[PDB]
Amino acid sequence: KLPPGWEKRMSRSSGRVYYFNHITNAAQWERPSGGKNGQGEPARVRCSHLLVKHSQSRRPSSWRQEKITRTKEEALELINGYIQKIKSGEEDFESLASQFSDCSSAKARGDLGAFSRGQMQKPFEDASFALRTGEMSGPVFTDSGIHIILRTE
Template sequence: MRNILHRDLGLHSYFNCWIPHNLTDDQRHKRVHFATEFLENLNGASDYLLAPIAGGGVLKAALSQLRPTEATPHPSVKPPGVKVSTKLYVEYGLKSMSSTNLPPNWVQRTSRSHNRDYFFNTVTRESQWDPPTEADVESTTIHNSGDGAPTQVRASHLLVKHRDSRRPSSWKEANITRSREEALALLDGYRQQIVSASGGDGQVEQREFSRLASQHSDCSSAKAGGDLGSFGRGQMQKPFEDAAFGLAVGRMSGPVVTESGVHIILRTA
């Protein structure tokens, strides 16, 4: 049987056993949700290949919404094999599987560790247990829509580098050897500390963010508590820019993957 997902880090056997060809549609949906949550944590790692297999109609249908510019034939396989990046798979492929009418950029996912659904913003990388409210949407819209869209934002970040970062060294460590998965785990721990110190209204405790950034960020901005100052479009790497401009003031992103490493971002103005 051909593997449904191939990548160059040796995960093909993992997915081969999780999404076999003989599952029912319901079972396959559940496995796809698991794979998506896993891929989310590896977003930006490398490209994935969706290969044609027996019973793969569910995934083909999910990817059928991709525009032609977002899916191109993989040179090593014959059509209908489709090469699609993790980001495109997660942000576009699973939209057709959502059973809830959600605001733009929000999707519903299932947390295996907590065995419950949660809601994820594919632009800002925010996640929350409760469905996004009108206030959540309006808050982002006010800051990011129409003629009132900002030309600049101000943000702080906490960066954790890994061995595959563009420059795997920092003011703390001359040679960074941790894996991307280890970097994501560290970042998640810092994010949970910040969330725990924050109120229940979604506003992030900036002092805790600054404290952790000053101690743990692999960016030189750690000296300023992670503060990057104000910046406009085109000044940051695209995933970072999209997340920062997509956030409302006082809100924190989920993990954002760039060539520099993995970040959490707090928009401050």
């Protein structure tokens, strides 16, 4: 049961029960699904993203700053902060990506356009295709850094 990647979990040293997606790293309180079968995954999707680079990114530099020195742990801290702000409603995905994404797609408010499998780095690809329209991922690690992905189509 539950859509691809989803599983009911419980927080450790805490007792909060929630739903987690092992492919997208998404987490939420709501059950992800309420019969359709043999649906597979979309052959093409459109996604926007917000990238946070770190010292170990293949290109430790971005339009936002010449030299990226933050550690991977610091980047994850930032990513989690952006997710928290989006989930509270204090900020929107587009505004944050336009201002803080280390990817040049920031100029397009994070929009990457449409793509098929075999086009993006595997972790990014797996997460994008496991997202349903309008859903946002949790932290996704690639060689570029850490991403937050939003499927728009």
